[PDB]
């Protein structure tokens with residue numbers, strides 16, 4: 001496959017559903033390269049667990065943890081890492097309230113080159129155990145010979161765009177990694193980088209991040225087809241922010257408008273949102289504790305009951321993962337019969353203004369609170385007009401894209417409710433025999 005899109009291993013499915021999945025131990029294995037140094041961008045860390053995932057012979061190589069924690073949380077993280085002399089930390093600045101550092105990325109510097117991994121999992125045991133998570137693996141990028149002058153750039157501008165993303169941190173430990181990236185040839189990259197960084201962007205910077213970045217890429221590198229208004233938009237996520245009192249405030253005005261862009265020319269497009277129901281969580285491999293990682297609060301939800309009429313159940317028979325709750329986030333544009341897609345995005349970004357940005361100042365400024373990162377698969381980047389949807393995720397056709405959940409998505413039933421993490425569920429017990437009492 002050209003796509004290099006993987007799911008994480010799930011404990012408890014049959015081996016045919018883990019063949020071609022990756023555990024973190026597989027990613028860090030010496031088979032992938034001889035590690036010299038690594039950077040782990042993430043949100044939540046279990047440092048003891050993390051060091052155990054590196055091969056024994058690599059466990060004292062330098063590791064940089066890039067995080068967003070402040071005050072006592074920051075103290076706790078430093079305390080976790082102090083036993084390990086080879087671990088340094090970088091606190092990403094979060095100068096806008098209610099922002100977080102959500103980006104999940106590994107930079108892996110080898111003897112043989114450089115690899116970039118953009119994924120959706122926290123660096124804790126439970127995120128790699130029984131959840132549906134996504135991984136994009138870069139090629140092995142070779143070093144550019146000392147004295148050679150070449151750009152090392154791809155047709156998707158990935159090298160410049162990744163450096164731009166790192167420059168936004170304004171951090172000395174990441175200037176070191178920027179210089180590493182400058183020294184390597186990333187020209188084989190066939191995905192586009194879509195990042196969010198905190199700030200207020202106007203003018204020439206408006207298109208750099210968030211949903212305006214997506215819109216710009218779709219305008220420039222995708223084509224509109226006849227009956228484009230019939231091609232749905234699908235969003236699939238593990239948390240929802242406060243989106244406003246009705247759909248016109250943000251979801252179906254600026255967000256959907258960005259996601260329905262195709263081509264350069266100037267809505268009733270169906271919008272499917274996939275988010276686990278209470279019954280999805282109850283009957284999951286983890287049971288109700290899976291809801292610990294689906295943090296939709298009742299305070300937020302009761303302000304926007306209009307939203308839930310868009311919600312569809314989690315179902316993933318195609319990858320044997322209907323009972324492995326999603327922490328992956330994906331967005332895509334299928335054809336009306338769900339047999340093709342015009343593009344696919346895997347990202348850390350949930351369905352929130354904090355992650356995707358919200359227009360301010362009379363439409364002239366895009367304000368983003370958080371760090372997020374994902375990669376966009378466009379048919380043009382692969383010499384194609386569209387992607388065929390792979391019928392079984394782990395089956396085997398070569399330019400068919402592996403969509404990890406079932407299509408068409410299934411609407412909530414009248415008795416279903418969206419998983420809301422801070423109210424009790426005591427009517428029916430979960431797969432481990434327990435109720436949920438927050």
Ligand SMILES: O=C(O)c1cnc2ccccc2c1O
Nearest residue numbers: 043102122292293294295348
């Ligand atoms: O990975 C993330 O982006 C993230 C961020 N905040 C979270 C808050 C509660 C539970 C899970 C969370 C999570 O999984």
